[PDB]
Amino acid sequence: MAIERTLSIVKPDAVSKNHIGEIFARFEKAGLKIVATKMKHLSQADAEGFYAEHKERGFFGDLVAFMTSGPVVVSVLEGENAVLAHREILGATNPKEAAPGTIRADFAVSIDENAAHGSDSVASAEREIAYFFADNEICPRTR
Amino acid sequence: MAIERTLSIVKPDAVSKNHIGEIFARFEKAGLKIVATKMKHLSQADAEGFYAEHKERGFFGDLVAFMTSGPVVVSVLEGENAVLAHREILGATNPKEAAPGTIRADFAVSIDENAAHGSDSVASAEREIAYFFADNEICPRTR
Amino acid sequence: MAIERTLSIVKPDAVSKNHIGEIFARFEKAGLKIVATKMKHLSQADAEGFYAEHKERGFFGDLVAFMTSGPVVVSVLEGENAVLAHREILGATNPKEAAPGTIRADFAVSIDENAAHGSDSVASAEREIAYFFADNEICPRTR
Amino acid sequence: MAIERTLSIVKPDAVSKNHIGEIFARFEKAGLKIVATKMKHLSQADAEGFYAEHKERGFFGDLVAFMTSGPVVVSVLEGENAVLAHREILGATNPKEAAPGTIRADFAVSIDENAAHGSDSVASAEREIAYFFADNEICPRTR
Amino acid sequence: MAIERTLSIVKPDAVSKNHIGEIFARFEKAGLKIVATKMKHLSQADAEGFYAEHKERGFFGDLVAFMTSGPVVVSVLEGENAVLAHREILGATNPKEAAPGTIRADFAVSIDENAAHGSDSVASAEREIAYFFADNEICPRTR
Amino acid sequence: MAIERTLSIVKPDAVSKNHIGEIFARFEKAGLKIVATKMKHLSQADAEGFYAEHKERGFFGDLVAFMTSGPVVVSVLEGENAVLAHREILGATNPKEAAPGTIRADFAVSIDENAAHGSDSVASAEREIAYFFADNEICPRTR
Amino acid sequence: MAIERTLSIVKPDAVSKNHIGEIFARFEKAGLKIVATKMKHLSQADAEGFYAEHKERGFFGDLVAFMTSGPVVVSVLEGENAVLAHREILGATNPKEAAPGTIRADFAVSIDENAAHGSDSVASAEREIAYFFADNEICPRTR
Amino acid sequence: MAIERTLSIVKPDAVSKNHIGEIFARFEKAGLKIVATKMKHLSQADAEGFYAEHKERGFFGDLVAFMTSGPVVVSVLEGENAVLAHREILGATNPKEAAPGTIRADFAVSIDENAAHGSDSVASAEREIAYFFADNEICPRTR
Ligand SMILES: [Mg+2]
Ligand SMILES: [Mg+2]
Ligand SMILES: [Mg+2]
Ligand SMILES: [Mg+2]
Ligand SMILES: [Mg+2]
Ligand SMILES: [Mg+2]
Ligand SMILES: [Mg+2]
Ligand SMILES: [Mg+2]
Ligand SMILES: [Mg+2]
Ligand SMILES: [Mg+2]
Ligand SMILES: [Mg+2]
Ligand SMILES: [Mg+2]
DSSP: OOEEEEEEEEOHHHHHTTOHHHHHHHHHHTTOEEEEEEEEOOOHHHHHHHTGGGTTSTTHHHHHHHHTSSOEEEEEEEEETHHHHHHHHHOOSSGGGSOTTSHHHHHOOSSSSOSEEEOSSHHHHHHHHHHHOOGGGOOOOOO | OOEEEEEEEEOHHHHHTTOHHHHHHHHHHTTOEEEEEEEEOOOHHHHHHHTGGGTTSTTHHHHHHHHTSSOEEEEEEEEETHHHHHHHHHOOSSGGGSOTTSHHHHHOOSSSSOSEEEOSSHHHHHHHHHHHOOGGGOOOOOO | OOEEEEEEEEOHHHHHTTOHHHHHHHHHHTTOEEEEEEEEOOOHHHHHHHTGGGTTSTTHHHHHHHHTSSOEEEEEEEEETHHHHHHHHHOOSSGGGSOTTSHHHHHOOSSSSOSEEEOSSHHHHHHHHHHHOOGGGOOOOOO | OOEEEEEEEEOHHHHHTTOHHHHHHHHHHTTOEEEEEEEEOOOHHHHHHHTGGGTTSTTHHHHHHHHTSSOEEEEEEEEETHHHHHHHHHOOSSGGGSOTTSHHHHHOOSSSSOSEEEOSSHHHHHHHHHHHOOGGGOOOOOO | OOEEEEEEEEOHHHHHTTOHHHHHHHHHHTTOEEEEEEEEOOOHHHHHHHTGGGTTSTTHHHHHHHHTSSOEEEEEEEEETHHHHHHHHHOOSSGGGSOTTSHHHHHOOSSSSOSEEEOSSHHHHHHHHHHHOOGGGOOOOOO | OOEEEEEEEEOHHHHHTTOHHHHHHHHHHTTOEEEEEEEEOOOHHHHHHHTGGGTTSTTHHHHHHHHTSSOEEEEEEEEETHHHHHHHHHOOSSGGGSOTTSHHHHHOOSSSSOSEEEOSSHHHHHHHHHHHOOGGGOOOOOO | OOEEEEEEEEOHHHHHTTOHHHHHHHHHHTTOEEEEEEEEOOOHHHHHHHTGGGTTSTTHHHHHHHHTSSOEEEEEEEEETHHHHHHHHHOOSSGGGSOTTSHHHHHOOSSSSOSEEEOSSHHHHHHHHHHHOOGGGOOOOOO | OOEEEEEEEEOHHHHHTTOHHHHHHHHHHTTOEEEEEEEEOOOHHHHHHHTGGGTTSTTHHHHHHHHTSSOEEEEEEEEETHHHHHHHHHOOSSGGGSOTTSHHHHHOOSSSSOSEEEOSSHHHHHHHHHHHOOGGGOOOOOO
16 A cells, blocks of 8 residues: 565574575565665664663574674665555565565574564554665665 | 685666676676675765766766766675676676676666776775774674 | 453554455444544654553564554454454464465565554553543443 | 545444444545544434534433443544544434435434434534643544 | 653632733743643533542532533643642642632632542552543653 | 734743733733733744745745744634734734834844734634634633 | 764865865764764765755755865764754854854865864664764774 | 875774873874774674784783774874884883873873874885775865
């Protein structure tokens, strides 16, 4: 219905196995537009800051360790219903539970190493995007 | 032979038509690794600075105009023989002259709007990479 | 059982998709009576005050942002075992975990945007009701 | 055509029989948005003030007595052609004369106890809304 | 000593003779801060609800009749020792017994029409404040 | 002449310095009657809505910032020639220009922090009152 | 009272005359901490985006032209009451109106070329900071 | 004689004590121009990469620890004989050995915490600048 933006992260597993292009191709085939992107290697503090909502959960340590183990690609995706649409093409967080043709089904090895992140809601998306990107960095399509 | 780095630019034509994923997939299928990447919208000065060696040639103004007409994606690609290997998968600068299966053959409309740039040599690659990236931004694979 | 009161909030997601009537119908079909109700758009301070117990948690920012993103409906529900009965009809906080026929199963998109809030206990209900309603506002059934 | 606002009252009969949700659902199914709502128990003076134009009519006393006999829900509904659209879904004032599927046909017992009120015109709607609501209380949809 | 809150009511006698400002000025001169206030005309039920503990006493009917005879102003006062300090400036309940310079001495005509109410204890103050005000309505000082 | 109503706001400066009583006393001494009043802390949106006529002026941002910096008291004053009479007792908008004995002369520090607002005309008064008050909230004098 | 953040811009005039250090020294002497900073040359689009709220105003074009005429320094300042404190040391927007040891008094030539920008409110500061900085770029003091 | 560029770092000690402006003022007073600047908090890897020439020295660990203990400011300074001129105003590496009026004499506590870094030669300056800055980021003076 309305045009939204959501954060994508290609996680270190998918980067290390050179799945960046294939994952991006799925987003673009589904009508999502890449309006910002950059490769980063997160420090402990960068990852802990991004995942601050899970600070008290049992998996926090392993999440941070995995997300700092290698470079990631962080992107802003724009389109109609972008938050939920991105979520549908990612599939279930647990890859064994994920529908066929989704990113988790096709590229994820396990729960921990599940290839990619997507924002869970519009509110989360704004916070997530703002964490990695200044508004001035986002490149609307002209041309 | 030995591990090199080369600059890739996905030009505004290919960005506007959402070919970023498909182009990146070709690089990765060929064994090149993306070790830095960012989406930018170049200003007149940014483009003029990158193309400064051609400041006095007749095509300069049109090149700058095209390369500032929409956002681009700038990347560093790493691999064995990366400079020439990247060039082979790009294909001939002129898309009507380009081999089938290359990026120019499949995504370029004309000479002017030829989808992507690649560094022509190791020496030009060093200069081109340093133009867009600080050494500290480049993310070697650790995982 | 004994007659209790509990707080309901129809959250901004469910308001924006015009589910207010359908949600209220479920409460009333189950024998809960609406004895106070009002539509409000919470300010940052109003939401932070209601959720003050989670002030130090990592999700606090996103919770406040979501709960101030659009108008809500706040209500007092009265009935036999109203606190737990309301909880049963809401279903599990996580909609993917929620039983069929519950509000979360039928109207919630995600954990973050889960359609509605209900008081978790009699003690929390007293505090939550008093936060939004003066005792003088509550309209017992005469008639 | 143009976006309007109209007053709805769910009268004490429909409140006492817990039809609030079902009535609201009909408004929302028809594309009307609830942009303000509150439950009140009207005093004699509150009801007399709202119905002041009929002060000299023979039915005035009965009307006031009925409208003060139990709590009501007062709401502002917004939408395209909201005044007439609301009227169509209410149906004829007399429930025995009302079309099937309307609120009067399905929830009203008699002329006197006819479940709900709707503003008759844009001009009456402005006056009626202003009677129960400050402009600052009305919650436009932002999400 | 500690910061407290107490309920003030300017009763209908003092409102009708336009003493609201002068009474408020006395509170503020004594170092009490007005953190919530509203003018209301209590219905029979509103007054009976506030005075519910005295429902079986002989004076109940006259109290309710007086407190519904005209509009009142209800307020929350905040300050050091606010409950007792408010009581000192009100003076004795019986105005003929009240110290000079108190509100009862200067504005009350009789026991029945004694200008103002103040909470008698911290416990009664909590109950009385909650009767007229939601916690969300109270405006702490932010300057 | 004729009985009018006008809006008064005691601004956050005068509230924070506990001048509410003294200001109200001046209104009442001049024969104006307080027929509605409430303390509020305005949000950004509430203040912007009230001051919408100055939206394009250079001072708008500072006005909104000041009027949201702390709680205010909003009131309806009734009396003969209430709009102009209220204006006379307020005095000139600029306190250095204001006559002695007026509210601006006695309580205002500067143009920006000028203690109180009054409606400038009958037409603005209708709009301003309706913004903060439902007609049903206004309390006519009955004794 | 509370720790805030505000945006500073050292404008092209003050950069061109090498006043960056002297301006920063004044901020730091006043107890403000520089927690993010970068030198940029704004494009037309960057400046238009930052000033988007004034897009329809008469001065818009001149503002954009001046703010793109040379490089600027953009910074986040942190401290107690940082927004207003920053404003006090900047002084009045018009340098001829500005108090003696303020930045406008000492470094500004005219209204147009007034040396520096500061956020006008907490709300504007949040938006302005987010325009130029990702949250991950801001460097809180450790150490 | 010729225009050069050199890297400046304001180290975490000088940042933490808010000496950034005073240090910058000294550079600018000496005729050096700030043509790029940014505040960063270096990770272990960022610092180790910059100081890679000292990787086998005994002090390497302490250098890295100190340079990652808080945020730094990294800058490019441009001017006549910039490398040596910058070195003269820094003064001797050891602050007890440093001439009066130099940065080390006035702001350094010890050898380890010596306030600032400057490139030692034109060759080291090229490498150091390129480490932190893309050529595209450097802002020549226009205007
Ligand atoms: Mg979330
Ligand atoms: Mg931009
Ligand atoms: Mg690095
Ligand atoms: Mg709990
Ligand atoms: Mg009541
Ligand atoms: Mg409002
Ligand atoms: Mg008696
Ligand atoms: Mg509140
Ligand atoms: Mg006007
Ligand atoms: Mg009324
Ligand atoms: Mg951080
Ligand atoms: Mg540039």
